[PDB]
């Protein structure tokens, strides 16, 4: 689908927080992004599920 | 024999919503525009779509600077 919807889960508490899209062919690997984790209250690395 | 045309978009209702000499509160939209035909001046802020609005209450006043149309707000005097 070239640009499939992906969701981001906090690395610490494993809460599925955000949802974006990315080019799977351009970035076949998983996504490393730092984002604001609401329940933790502090920016934590976010892992695409 | 048929026409390949006939498609049109909605009319976006641009224009100058607030004209010179009018009293505006904070945040009222002054001009709804697409490009920067009108440029922000004093106490006038630019929106995301180049929509202009007011950061401070006062009276609108159109002006020019460096050959550019600008929109300003003069701080009307308290009674």
């Amino acid at each position: 689908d070239v640009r499939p919807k992906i969701t981001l889960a906090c690395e610490v508490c494993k809460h599925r927080n955000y949802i974006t899209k990315k080019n799977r062919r351009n970035d076949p690997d998983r996504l490393e992004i730092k984002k604001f984790c609401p329940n933790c209250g502090t920016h934590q690395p976010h892992k695409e599920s | 024999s048929s026409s390949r045309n006939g498609r049109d978009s909605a009319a976006q209702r641009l224009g100058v919503k607030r004209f010179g000499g009018q009293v505006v509160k904070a945040g009222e939209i002054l001009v709804r525009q697409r490009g920067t035909h009108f440029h922000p001046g004093v106490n006038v802020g630019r929106g995301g779509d180049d929509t202009l609005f007011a950061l401070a209450p006062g009276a609108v006043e159109f002006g020019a600077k460096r050959g550019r149309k600008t929109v300003n707000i003069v701080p009307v005097a308290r009674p």
């Binding site: 919807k5 949802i19 974006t20 899209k21 | -």
Partner: protein, 63 residues
């Protein structure tokens, strides 16, 4: 015979303390990844129903 309150309208509208009629906003069920938080933030909470359809709604809820 009694007057049967409309089932659909009874499940979508509300009466507040003063007698206002409130409703919820649309466009918030699905397909909202691309809807920015600003759009979703303005699309939640109860809103007083427009006076255009306030006449019809009162007829449905009361009868």
């Amino acid at each position: 015979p009694k007057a049967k309150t409309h089932s659909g309208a009874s499940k979508r509208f509300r009466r507040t303390g003063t007698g206002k009629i409130v409703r919820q906003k649309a466009n918030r069920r699905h397909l909202l990844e691309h809807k920015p938080t600003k759009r979703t933030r303005r699309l939640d909470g109860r809103t007083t129903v427009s006076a255009a359809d306030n006449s019809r709604i009162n007829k449905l809820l009361n009868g």
